[PDB]
Design a protein around this nucleic acid. Structure first.
Lengths: 85, 544, 225, 35, 248
DNA sequence: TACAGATTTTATGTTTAGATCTTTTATGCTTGCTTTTCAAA
DNA sequence: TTTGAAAAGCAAGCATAAAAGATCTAAACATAAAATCTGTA
């Protein structure tokens, strides 16, 4: 309004999955890698509630916060103004 | 006490057909035996054709699955609307072993169990045709070194909508690792019951891109093009051709109840037709008259109850406006060619106009009322052949003595009852259940469950239990209850409790509490606590 | 395919292949990121449709061939119930994404004998957009009440819909299809009053379902956000 | 016979199963265990 | 108190908000105290005396339904009985005294396995062990056991394919009192009985008490059951089923 | 007596079904305040 | 046509149910070497 393509949700889904794969987002209250084999074996026999709801409703948390995003994104980047809330 | 146990087997002592005598007990036993034999010869004639239709649809489904399956990526087949009951048989490709591996969501708690079950099945099949190994994907790596031949694995996933899609996804990328081996071919079969848009949003996009390289949709169900159904209906019509009539209300009830079931509508149709045939051969004494052998013993009761007919009354009113047993026999030789008309119209739609997507039950409905033209106007191809394809529904006297009809509400009481509503109307009314004939108490005092259900219905969503007890207590006559509890003098403790001045406050309270726990067992009420029992809330509203 | 589109119609062949790879990268690097495998899959999917538009005029100039095969570089293209069940699913979404206090304002259409005031509805429009959050939990009787409120229709005809055995059979089938979820996933007791219910499908599927039977489910969410 | 798993490191002691109560006919038939 | 009573209007109407000045905070402390013996005595007096004659008249009315029940059982339909009141005496009198010797005479008694769903101790493994003690089926091979499968369900699935090719004679009368009872309503237990109900050689007679019991069965389970529903309301006391629910 | 095979005993590993406790989050009651249609004049 | 007044809505706060899951165990399923029991011989 002040061009840049708008991508649809169908195409932003793959970007979201790559961002989950690159460890930018974590699932909410996720234990992650277990300490020993017995606890990992117990975890493998349990169906977590995040794996049964659709992916658009799964809760995620940031590994990098927006204040850290503003520090290392260059000021000549076109999305740099949106790193400040 | 065996009633206080879990399961007990008993052997009854012993010191033959379930058909009863009709005509208010005046029907002979030979007519009962004949009606039994005629019901069985129609029932077996219908179900033999049902068996041949079921075997044919299974064989055709196997043939099209094999045709899609055999015509560095998976060969993916999506069977849409599949109830996971198909037996998928594989041909014996020369110099190569074809192995079927079936996977259930109960058999798939995680990826490790999926691989271990798959590799145990593979090793068991390979040893059963042609030292042990680790049940692991390295067996796929060394399959040619251990068995000499190469391998073709066909994975059939039973009930994919109920599986954990993360586990299935990780199993698909795990199976993708077998593409680097030269001697391995992998096919996947997904039995989908909802549609493909539900399963493309639960898998990851890389998995979709992996599955896109070789995939085939196949929408195989029971509602696909109405073919299998119409064959069952035509088999039933050919069973009853020349002897029995189908009412339009019966056919529309079949259409309405078969609309409400999608996955298993075929055996529902067989069930409704079966119960209709059972009802006709249990109710009607004229069921022995569907063949001309048994027309030699028509008695006075038969002539009495065939004279109470609307068609006969219209016919004799027409004759007295214009102008008995032999005349009743005279209405048996006629054809009623509506079934032949329906099968001729179906054949003309099928192999002349190349129209397959028609419902023969709804076609028979429109032929029964007479609105065939409005049903045939939709295809826009029978504009010039509508007059030859149309024939007037003939009216035959004494048709309703040989008729599958739905007017009493029997077929919607035994097969599709209003269960919750039946419980509610039994609890609220209660004089429609118990007969109105403790001789004084039954005419003034309600049963405790029916009396409680009234105050249940007229209260609010949360009910205090003590005020509900008080409202129960005001509906009971204390003097008649104390008189009835003193009727038996042979029980000493009852008499010594009745003369105690708070006896009615004991009696009404314990009848109230046994009704409350009865309501809790039926599921009408619940408690809004675990440690307290002071407030209930109701879960059942009448009329829903 | 490339050696059949030439004959039936090596440096230049490499030029066409490299130009196609550069066009795929330029169109879809924003979509794939720096993934080699995703771009390989897109090259595999879009190569034969690009070959099928190469003529003798498009082989020597890249701009006319890019204009002729433009549709391959705007979209990714990497993709593959009864009336009672559909209205039960729609009622489940209504029960999961509306508040129970506002039900008496939307569905109540009965004439009153005993004097009583209907619910006023929500006072102010909130901006939460509740379809972006996880669904809430509801009971069976609210589901059946809203189901007969929204189901399609002299003294013995009984206009409303009864909760007979086929409605419950369809609801059990919906739970079997994992379109309705419970709090329990294993050893589920269906008859317990402490078991609650939620919809398991998003908005993009109920839109297709509601428009397959022509139900205005988007009017029901227009009073908020 | 194809085995669903293998226990290839079983080390079983040579210890018998019949107890002391079943190696004599009766209580009065038990000899002097000191000798 | 409300303008509507029934339908969804009554449901939404009776779910209002009640102010704390009309909270009705009465409790069960303000009640005449009772213990087990007098409650049992006066209760059994009202069960054996109050409205006994019209209940017996209704029972004699529904004795005439028994040939229709037998005719439904010989055609492959399973019987499910519902209604307000207990149905234990109905099923025990119909299956043992009437159905078993007349089925035995019509095929020239038939054993009756009776399951108590009100008891929480009912278990599908012991019940199927008694089933295999009665029917003595062929034992599962090694290939049919698969990999840690449920041996009960796999052996019933073997029995289904075996009993398709047998003569259609009823070898066993299975009675399930309170199919919707607490331990007995579970999905494994219902799967086992649906798979048994596929077998034509076993007659299934069952009862139910919960008003939400059709929610227990999906399309596959209802197809395997193949029920004919019968409303028998009789207002029986439910003396035996209440013994696993302390009423005090 | 006496040895070969079948069955039992004892011992351990594998997988599924389910119970119990802990922690964080949803929900329902309470009190106060403000909006809004409803039977009566 | 108004008119006050009770039904209903919104909000904060706190006690409490309930979901989610971490941890663990019993039981079903499975294998297996040594001892023990039949069974002829």
């Amino acid at each position: 309004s002040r061009t840049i393509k708008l991508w649809l949700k169908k195409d932003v889904k793959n970007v979201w999955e790559n961002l989950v794969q690159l460890d930018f987002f974590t699932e909410k209250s996720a234990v992650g890698l277990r300490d020993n084999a017995t606890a990992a074996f117990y975890a493998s026999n349990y169906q977590f509630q995040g794996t049964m709801i659709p992916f658009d409703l799964r809760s995620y948390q940031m590994q990098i916060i927006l204040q850290e995003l503003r520090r290392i994104i260059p000021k000549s980047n076109m999305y740099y103004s949106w790193t400040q809330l | 006490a065996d009633a206080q146990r879990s399961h007990y087997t008993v052997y009854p002592s012993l010191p033959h057909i379930p058909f009863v005598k009709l005509l208010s007990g005046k029907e002979s036993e030979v007519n009962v035996e004949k009606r039994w034999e005629l019901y069985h010869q129609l029932h077996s004639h219908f179900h033999d054709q049902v068996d041949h239709i079921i075997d044919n649809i299974e064989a055709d489904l196997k043939a099209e699955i094999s045709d899609l399956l055999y015509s560095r990526c998976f060969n993916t087949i999506f069977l849409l609307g599949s109830d996971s009951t198909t037996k998928i048989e594989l041909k014996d490709e020369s110099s190569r072993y074809n192995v079927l591996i079936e996977l259930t969501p109960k058999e798939s708690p995680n990826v490790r169990m999926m691989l271990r079950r798959s590799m145990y099945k593979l090793y068991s099949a390979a040893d059963a045709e042609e030292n042990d190994v680790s049940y692991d994907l390295s067996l796929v790596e060394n399959f040619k070194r251990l068995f000499g031949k190469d391998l073709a694995m066909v994975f059939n996933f039973k009930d994919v909508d109920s599986i954990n899609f993360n586990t299935l996804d990780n199993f698909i990328i795990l199976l993708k690792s077998a593409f680097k081996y030269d001697h391995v071919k992998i096919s996947l079969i997904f039995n989908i019951n909802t549609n493909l848009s539900n399963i493309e949003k639960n898998l990851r996009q890389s998995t979709i891109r992996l599955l896109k390289r070789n995939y085939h949709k196949l929408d195989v169900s029971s509602n696909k093009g109405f073919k299998y159904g119409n064959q069952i209906f035509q088999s039933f019509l050919d069973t009853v051709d020349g002897k029995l009539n189908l009412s339009d209300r019966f056919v529309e009830f079949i259409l309405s109840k078969m609309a409400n079931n999608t996955n298993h509508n075929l055996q529902l149709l067989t069930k409704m037709l079966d119960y209709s045939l059972m009802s006709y051969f249990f109710q009607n004494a004229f069921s022995v008259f569907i063949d001309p052998v048994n027309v030699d013993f028509l008695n006075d009761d038969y002539l009495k109850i065939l004279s109470r007919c609307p068609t006969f009354m219209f016919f004799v009113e027409g004759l007295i406006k214009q102008h008995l047993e032999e005349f009743f026999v005279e209405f048996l030789v006629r054809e009623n060619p509506i079934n032949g008309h329906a099968k001729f119209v179906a054949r003309f739609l099928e192999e002349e106009l190349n129209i397959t997507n028609f419902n023969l039950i709804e076609l028979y409905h429109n032929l029964l009322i007479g609105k065939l033209d409005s049903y045939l106007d939709r295809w826009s191809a029978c504009k010039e052949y509508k007059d030859r394809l149309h024939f007037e529904p003939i009216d035959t006297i004494f048709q309703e003595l040989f008729t599958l009809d739905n007017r009493s509400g029997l077929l919607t009481q035994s097969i599709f009852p209003s269960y919750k509503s039946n419980i509610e109307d039994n609890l609220l009314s209660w004089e429609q259940v118990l007969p109105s004939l403790s001789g004084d108490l039954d005419k003034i005092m309600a049963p405790v469950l029916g009396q409680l259900f009234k105050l249940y219905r007229e209260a609010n969503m949360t009910i205090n239990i003590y005020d509900f007890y008080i409202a129960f207590r005001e509906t009971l006559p204390k003097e008649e209850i104390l008189n009835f509890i003193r009727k038996d003098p042979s029980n000493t403790k009852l008499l010594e409790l009745a003369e105690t001045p708070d006896a009615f406050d004991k009696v009404a309270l314990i009848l109230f509490m046994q009704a409350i726990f009865a309501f809790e067992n039926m599921g009408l009420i619940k408690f809004q606590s675990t440690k307290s029992y002071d407030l209930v809330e109701k879960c059942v509203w009448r009329g829903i | 395919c490339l050696r059949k589109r030439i004959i039936e119609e090596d440096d230049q062949f490499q030029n066409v292949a490299a130009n196609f790879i550069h066009l795929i990268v330029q169109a879809f690097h924003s979509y794939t990121g720096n993934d080699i495998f995703a771009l390989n899959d897109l090259i595999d999917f879009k190569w034969p449709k690009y070959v099928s538009r190469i003529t003798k005029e498009n082989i020597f100039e890249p701009l006319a061939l890019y204009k002729s095969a433009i549709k391959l570089f705007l979209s990714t293209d990497d993709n593959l119930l009864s009336i009672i069940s559909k209205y039960l699913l729609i009622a489940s979404y209504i029960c999961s994404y509306l508040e129970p206090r506002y039900d008496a304002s939307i569905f109540s259409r009965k004439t009153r004998i005993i004097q009583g005031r209907a619910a006023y509805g929500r006072r102010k429009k909130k901006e939460v957009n509740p379809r972006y959050l996880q669904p809430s939990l509801f009971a069976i009787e609210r589901l059946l009440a809203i189901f007969q409120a929204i189901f399609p229709i002299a003294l013995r005809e009984e206009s409303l819909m009864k909760a007979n055995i086929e409605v419950f059979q369809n609801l059990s089938e919906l739970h079997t299809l994992k379109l309705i979820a419970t709090t329990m996933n294993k050893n589920i007791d269906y008859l317990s009053p402490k078991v609650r219910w939620k919809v398991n499908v998003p908005w993009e599927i109920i839109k297709e379902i509601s428009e397959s039977v022509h139900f205005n489910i988007s009017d029901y969410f227009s009073d908020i956000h | 016979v194809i085995r669903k798993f293998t226990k290839k490191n079983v080390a079983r002691a040579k210890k018998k199963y019949t107890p002391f109560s079943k190696r004599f006919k009766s209580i009065a038939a038990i000899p002097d265990l000191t000798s | 108190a409300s303008s509507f009573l029934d339908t969804f209007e009554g449901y939404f109407d009776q779910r209002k908000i009640v102010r704390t000045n009309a909270k009705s905070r009465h409790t069960m402390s303000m009640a005449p105290d009772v213990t087990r013996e007098e409650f049992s005595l006066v209760s059994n007096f009202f069960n054996e005396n109050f409205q006994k004659r019209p209940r017996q008249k209704l029972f004699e009315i529904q004795k005439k339904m028994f040939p229709q029940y037998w005719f439904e059982l010989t055609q492959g339909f399973s019987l499910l009985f519902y209604g307000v009141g207990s149905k234990r005496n109905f099923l025990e009198e119909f299956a043992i005294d009437y159905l078993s010797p007349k089925i035995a005479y019509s095929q020239l008694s038939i054993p009756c396995l009776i399951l108590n769903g009100y008891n929480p101790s009912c278990n599908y493994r012991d019940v199927f062990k008694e089933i295999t003690d009665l029917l003595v089926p062929a034992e599962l091979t090694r290939s049919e056991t698969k990999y840690w499968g449920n041996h009960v369900i796999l052996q019933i699935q073997k029995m289904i394919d075996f009993y398709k090719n047998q003569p259609l004679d009823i070898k066993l009368i299975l009675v399930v009192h309170n199919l919707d009872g607490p331990s007995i309503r579970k999905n494994t237990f219902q799967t086992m009985l649906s798979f048994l109900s596929v077998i034509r050689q076993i007659a299934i007679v069952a009862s139910t008490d919960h008003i939400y019991a059709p929610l227990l069965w999906d399309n596959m389970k209802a197809q395997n059951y193949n029920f004919v529903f019968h409303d028998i309301s009789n207002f029986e006391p439910s003396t035996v089923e209440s013994t696993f629910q302390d009423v005090m």
